[PDB]
Amino acid sequence: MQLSREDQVAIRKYLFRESICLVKDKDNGNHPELNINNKQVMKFLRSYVSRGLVEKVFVWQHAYFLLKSEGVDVLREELYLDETEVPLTYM
Amino acid sequence: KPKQDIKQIILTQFSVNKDGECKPLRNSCSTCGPSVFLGRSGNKEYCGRCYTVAILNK
RNA sequence: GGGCAAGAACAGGUCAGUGAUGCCCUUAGAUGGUAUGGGCUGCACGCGCACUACAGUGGUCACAGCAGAAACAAAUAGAAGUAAAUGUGAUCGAGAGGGAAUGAGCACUGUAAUGUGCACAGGAACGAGGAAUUGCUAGUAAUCGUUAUCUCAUUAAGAAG
RNA sequence: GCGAUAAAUUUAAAGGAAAUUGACGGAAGAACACCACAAGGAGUGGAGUGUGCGGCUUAAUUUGACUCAACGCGGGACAGCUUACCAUACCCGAUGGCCGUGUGAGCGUAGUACGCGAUAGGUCAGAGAGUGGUGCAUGGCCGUUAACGACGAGUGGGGUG
Ligand SMILES: [K+]
Ligand SMILES: [K+]
Ligand SMILES: [K+]
Ligand SMILES: [Mg+2]
Ligand SMILES: [Mg+2]
Ligand SMILES: [Mg+2]
Ligand SMILES: [Mg+2]
Ligand SMILES: [Mg+2]
Ligand SMILES: [Mg+2]
Ligand SMILES: [Mg+2]
Ligand SMILES: [Mg+2]
Ligand SMILES: [Mg+2]
Ligand SMILES: [Mg+2]
Ligand SMILES: [Mg+2]
Ligand SMILES: [Mg+2]
Ligand SMILES: [Zn+2]
Numbered sequence: 001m002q003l004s005r006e007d008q009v010a011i012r013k014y015l016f017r018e019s020i021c022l023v024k025d026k027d028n029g030n031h032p033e034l035n036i037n038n039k040q041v042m043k044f045l046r047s048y049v050s051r052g053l054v055e056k057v058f059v060w061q062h063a064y065f066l067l068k069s070e071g072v073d074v075l076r077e078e079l080y081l082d083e084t085e086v087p088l089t090y091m
Numbered sequence: 092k093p094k095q096d097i098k099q100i101i102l103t104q105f106s107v108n109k110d111g112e113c114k115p116l117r118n119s120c121s122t123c124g125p126s127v128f129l130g131r132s133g134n135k136e137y138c139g140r141c142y143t144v145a146i147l148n149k
Numbered sequence: 150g151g152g153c154a155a156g157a158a159c160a161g162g163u164c165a166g167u168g169a170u171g172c173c174c175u176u177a178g179a180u181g182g183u184a185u186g187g188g189c190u191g192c193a194c195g196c197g198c199a200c201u202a203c204a205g206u207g208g209u210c211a212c213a214g215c216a217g218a219a220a221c222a223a224a225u226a227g228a229a230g231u232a233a234a235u236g237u238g239a240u241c242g243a244g245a246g247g248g249a250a251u252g253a254g255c256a257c258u259g260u261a262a263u264g265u266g267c268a269c270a271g272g273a274a275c276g277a278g279g280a281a282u283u284g285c286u287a288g289u290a291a292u293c294g295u296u297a298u299c300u301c302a303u304u305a306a307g308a309a310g
Numbered sequence: 311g312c313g314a315u316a317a318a319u320u321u322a323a324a325g326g327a328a329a330u331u332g333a334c335g336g337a338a339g340a341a342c343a344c345c346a347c348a349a350g351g352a353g354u355g356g357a358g359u360g361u362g363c364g365g366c367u368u369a370a371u372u373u374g375a376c377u378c379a380a381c382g383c384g385g386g387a388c389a390g391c392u393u394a395c396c397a398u399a400c401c402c403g404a405u406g407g408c409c410g411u412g413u414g415a416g417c418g419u420a421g422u423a424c425g426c427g428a429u430a431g432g433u434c435a436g437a438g439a440g441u442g443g444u445g446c447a448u449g450g451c452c453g454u455u456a457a458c459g460a461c462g463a464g465u466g467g468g469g470u471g
Contacts, residue, residue: 004429025168043404051404096422096423104424135420139418139419159455163374163451164448180440184398187370188371194365196362199382259389261389283353292352
């Protein structure tokens with residue numbers, strides 16, 4: 001997918017910090033909150049959707065990504081956070 | 092595209108004194124950090140992070 | 150004066166509007182993207198729809214003057230913009246009507262002229278149209294301009310007002 | 311010419327009978343309408359140009375649509391983009407199994423010894439993508455019948471239907 005290891009962990013932490021992501025299709029521009037190329041962010045999240053970790057809904061020109069509960073844990077193992085840590089959407 | 096030859100375990104970059112102290116055998120780049128070493132072939136000395144080739148006057 | 154507008158139909162049109170879609174096909178030497186160019190605008194020829202005409206109920210010069218309403222740096226020949234038919238006086242006198250093909254120029258838009266504007270030359274057919282054929286009953290037809298409407302970097306002889 | 315009267319062969323029904331609903335009539339009777347006419351008015355068809363269509367040419371001149379209801383139509387006024395077509399060049403690949411890998415998978419290079427490192431290796435399954443095909447596999451939306459007077463439900467009546 002052609003992302004650096006730094007860029008990969010930047011997406012992992014964002015997607016855990018906030019339980020959602022929003023990406024614009026057919027764009028060579030940079031994602032406002034990450035400073036990563038839009039097509040590359042789409043391609044990264046694509047894998048998480050295929051793995052069944054993330055829902056995808058496509059509306060007009062935007063892809064809305066939602067992290068499932070049964071995948072918060074997988075991303076918590078992957079990102080090696082403490083067992084007490086949860087997203088802003090989870091009390 | 093072409094095939095990539097491989098040189099196994101890279102240890103040739105260094106030399107070891109009788110005291111066990113180690114020093115680089117190839118010379119080192121001034122502008123890419125001293126941790127980047129410089130190749131040799133004929134009139135050419137060359138570098139990695141910059142692809143710059145020096146041409147010797149010999 | 151518009152707008153909304155039965156039931157039933159049609160193997161009527163669109164997979165080239167669609168993260169609407171079944172099935173077949175291709176898929177790193179791609180039928181996927183991108184970039185630089187060329188074409189879509191080629192020319193013996195037959196057709197459909199529009200635009201200027203064939204003059205005197207005209208052409209040319211100047212002067213006025215009126216819309217739907219309200220937006221307009223500057224510019225010394227000239228190089229987008231707030232009507233035009235029209236009203237008065239002059240002029241021209243029966244191809245001084247008409248502006249097609251073309252020359253060396255002078256500018257503008259643009260990443261790039263091949264596109265557009267301007268000045269000078271040049272001056273083709275056409276002298277009211279065979280067989281046929283299309284709308285239109287009143288502020289209608291026909292005439293005359295105009296779009297802070299749509300296309301639009303620049304381009305209307307197109308639509309929609 | 312008449313009277314009287316066979317076979318071989320062929321075939322699933324027969325312009326067989328009466329009635330019913332439609333479609334049609336160079337049948338009758340009512341209505342209606344300048345996409346009909348009468349009474350009129352302006353044109354189109356002829357000329358030059360703008361634009362679309364066929365034919366032929368080309369490396370490519372990408373393509374749909376054909377009586378009304380194809381042909382300034384696809385919001386189709388194409389220098390790039392649009393753009394599907396032609397010439398050259400460059401770039402890429404969900405996941406899962408197996409195997410192989412930091413003693414270095416693969417990548418960059420003035421390509422061989424230097425720089426970067428799991429990211430992007432091979433093979434089987436399986437995804438996804440495509441202005442690629444089929445509107446005679448569809449949905450949606452349009453146009454046309456038609457802007458026409460018709461249109462079905464419940465209860466009663468008649469007929470074997
Ligand atoms: K005519
Ligand atoms: K049309
Ligand atoms: K349909
Ligand atoms: Mg059909
Ligand atoms: Mg064309
Ligand atoms: Mg004249
Ligand atoms: Mg048009
Ligand atoms: Mg007899
Ligand atoms: Mg008549
Ligand atoms: Mg004509
Ligand atoms: Mg009709
Ligand atoms: Mg191109
Ligand atoms: Mg394309
Ligand atoms: Mg498609
Ligand atoms: Mg059909
Ligand atoms: Zn260097």
